[PDB]
Amino acid sequence: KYTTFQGSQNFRLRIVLATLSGKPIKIEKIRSGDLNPGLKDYEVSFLRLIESVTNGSVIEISYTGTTVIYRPGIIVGGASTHICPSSKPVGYFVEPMLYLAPFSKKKFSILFKGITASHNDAGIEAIKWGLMPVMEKFGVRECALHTLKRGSPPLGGGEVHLVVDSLIAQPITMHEIDRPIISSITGVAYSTRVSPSLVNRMIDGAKKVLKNLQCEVNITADVWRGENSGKSPGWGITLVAQSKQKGWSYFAEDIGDAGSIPEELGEKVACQLLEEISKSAAVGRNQLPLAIVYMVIGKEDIGRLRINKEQIDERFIILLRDIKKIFNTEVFLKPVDEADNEDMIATIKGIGFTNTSKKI
Amino acid sequence: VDLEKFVPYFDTFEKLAKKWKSVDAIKERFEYDTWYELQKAKISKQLEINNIEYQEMTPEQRQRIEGFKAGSYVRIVFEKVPMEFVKNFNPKFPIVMGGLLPTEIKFGIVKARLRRHRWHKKILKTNDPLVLSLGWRRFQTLPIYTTTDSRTRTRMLKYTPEHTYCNAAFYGPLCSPNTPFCGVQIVANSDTGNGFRIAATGIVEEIDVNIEIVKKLKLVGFPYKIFKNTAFIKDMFSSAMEVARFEGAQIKTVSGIRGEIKRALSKPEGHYRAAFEDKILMSDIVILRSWYPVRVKKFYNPVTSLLLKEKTEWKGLRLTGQIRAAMNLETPSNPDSAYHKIERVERHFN
């Protein structure tokens, strides 16, 4: 019948996991006890994105709006435009597609429109330098997110173009049992509709914390200005720690609010970047669910990924339970033989997924 | 708490700042001869990893992850099995159980490159039943044979080409591309006859839930008033409103003279004015090339030989040839369509 889910938690993953697995799902009791029950505007918009990229799918939303029945179709993709409501930025709609784009009949060429940043959702430069490189390690050679216009909150007005030219049968089997060495730290500090000095004031703040490090720190000042600067003033930074040895990346990001000091945010994010590195073994937390899912959908092969005990949190635990309810694969965790640190190796067997939509 | 929030939880800024006045904690971070053998080494190397990891597992943990491996003797229990299977159970007839990948479960339109088998006597026909063998499954479908028309459209054919492949679309369970298959028209011993039975051979190229097969639909009219380039046409359209839709449409005569539909004539209904690159004659016939959508019939009749008592006389939908003979009906024919020899008188002009 239907593998039943409860609540709104992991809504995007549960639909995406259902679409990948092809198993129909039912999700009920979405905000039952709240004053405003049922799906939010950004959630229903997210659903509409799925049918633009899937063909033959049946999505049914209950009368009260608290229950949804999803019967996945075949990933077809193609060129399209999606207007993202102001309740959520483009990154809220971009990131689920990254799970599906390499598994399509036709290349994804999607133009998203709306707000391009928020405090809780993936930014443009998180996706560009933080998530795609994880895919590139998984065998998605060609992927890009072109920034045509930035739109700061609350008015937004930005637009980004998602293009995934690479179509592959399944992700290459993962084997990362080491702790990557960080060769350099880079990042993008950006601003819209304000004086350029703000970008430099962040770069002063981040440079202050990171100068104690023995590696280079080169942060780009991407001041946006003119017609392409969006409709509201805004600014934020994202710092990425790169490991050129095996193309591994950890990152942290944040945007600035009204009344906030540019130097302080530069201090905070650079402070958070170091925190994420402390919490990372091979991939950071905000990268992990992508890594976990891709290894699940690999060949009938055992994939090894080193993780830190600090990463294995409530977000991690709920992800794994969701994976098993759809895929039934169980992730086994083994300690490392080293005593200098407390890592653990995550071992996962792929379900033998294959891109059956692509014409040959 | 929930992954809808992409950004992970962090401690308060001041506490993070105090933690990170000193960054001493994190300072610690900062030949095969032939290419064939290299690929084999990669396969063998990874296969080595599976054995090592499984050996480290518990035997119960092994079964939980990998499952039951080949070589295991296993008891599988089923429910809701048809009662005919247990009753009409012949030990001579094998029972083959096949696990299904998620794709195999789905039903939809399957695209295949299909040819008549070289030893089969007759060419197959569109919308003509055919028992297919895809993957683990055997079933009967109504395929539609099509051509690409120089890779511009999906035009419906009437029969398989005599000695070459042709794209076929049929409704049934989906299967991965590169899934070969074969087709048979007759499986019963009664209708075996002597002729070779394997009817079609092909490879599945694409799976989809929709298709836009189209058929060439040609409108025909005749001229009744010719004025140099201009000429009036009749019998193409039944009312002026139809002509309004097709104004500006390209048309041509049999002779090859191209033209255009200019305007609809008020009297009589359906007549219209057309201008041709050169004067047309009365004997000529004007044609408008139009395209009409065609739909794949959703017919799924899985072969269930084992359930039957005979197990060798399963019969499903019959061919168009056999149905006509049973009902004593003649092969439909059109007198104008037939070909005759024509003798051309020598052309002379004043």
Binding site: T54, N55, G56, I59, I61, Y63, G65 | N210
Partner: peptide, 14 residues
């Protein structure tokens, strides 16, 4: 042109 090659669609009963 959007409707030409689609079999699914969003069914909103709200």
């Amino acid at each position: 042109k959007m409707m030409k090659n689609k079999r699914g669609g969003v069914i909103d009963k709200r």
